[PDB]
């Protein structure tokens, strides 16, 4: 069902082309922004559903769910509300200022927390949230992400005991967009070539 | 309403002791809904009651926005359940490299409904209203689960915003007494505190 999902994303302007610098400091000709999904109720639901379905298809076990701040937060909420799962919230809005504790919700050490994320590049953002949760005594083995950019994330997460499960890779997303005439072939070629370097 | 209060009790939402509120006054009671994320059924019920309050008021709006932070998931559930477009206010500490203040599709002149967990002075609601107004949205109404009855309705009215409350602190204390979760002493103590706090 990726074709409709990707089009849906394109139509909330999820795909930005231009010259960007990523969290990891990499230049990129493309930037994928899922903040707009909250403007299209059905699309937000579709994204929540496919994320959850990805976790279920993998056959994994978890007691609770945490979104990586900020864009993934509503996705976690919809998943948890629809499927009746307790949720944890990592509060990042005051960063490391003062001494208030960073994680909201019921933390029962030994329980497994599933991570929900929007886009993974290097993997560092997921891992930062993973470490925070592990330091509270929670077990964390799996992360589900909507878009894997395929820039080292799976391998970096696996090096820390985390299995990355993605709905779609960047290359598959670019292929759908070209097939659907949303982006031209030269842009896809340029974007792929650039990323490779 | 009773069942909703019981759920809130279970997620330890009612704290007693001595607390300084954001408005700088001391209080014998604090209502902390942060634990509601651990009970998705209760979260949904809270979300539904807030939305029904708006619907029974016959107000109209184009989008919905929660006051940071506890209410963010309540707005998300209202919007998800009822298929309403959402805005998210992103409140941080004005550090270097902050991003836009409101996420989602902003159509200037459209009307945004504000959703809140607890109102005391009304200042927290008003801050969010002003951010949305600056971004070009019309705001006329706020729905709050618990109105602590410390001048919120008036403060908000003074800035053109009508506060609708699901429940007041007075009422919630009565329900809590009925359910034998709080004694006839601390009920009086908190009651006395409410008239005191209006000064
Ligand atoms: O900055 C990125 O690398 C990034 C690329 C992109 O296409 N979309 C995007 O949202 N990002 C943001 O950067 C974070 C991922 O970068 P890593 O921490 O390197 O995986 C994600 O959580 C995104 O929020
Ligand atoms: O500090 C409060 O007033 C307050 C009291 C309370 O019982 N529960 C509670 O959550 N608050 C928080 O304080 C703010 C409400 O205070 P005002 O900004 O004065 O209306 C909101 O951010 C509330 O979430
Ligand atoms: Cl949320």
From Swiss-Prot, chain B:
Subunit structure: Homodimer; dimerization is required for enzymatic activity.
UniProt superkingdom: Eukaryota
Name the UniProt record assigns to this protein: Uridine 5'-monophosphate synthase
Biological function: Bifunctional enzyme catalyzing the last two steps of de novo pyrimidine biosynthesis, orotate phosphoribosyltransferase (OPRT), which converts orotate to orotidine-5'-monophosphate (OMP), and orotidine-5'-monophosphate decarboxylase (ODC), the terminal enzymatic reaction that decarboxylates OMP to uridine monophosphate (UMP).
Segment of the intact protein contained: 8 to 203 of 480
UniProt-annotated stretches for the region OPRTase: 1-196
Record-listed Phosphotyrosine modification sites: 30
Entry similarity comment: In the N-terminal section; belongs to the purine/pyrimidine phosphoribosyltransferase family.
Disease involvement: Orotic aciduria 1: A disorder of pyrimidine metabolism resulting in megaloblastic anemia and orotic acid crystalluria that is frequently associated with some degree of physical and intellectual disability. A minority of cases have additional features, particularly congenital malformations and immune deficiencies.
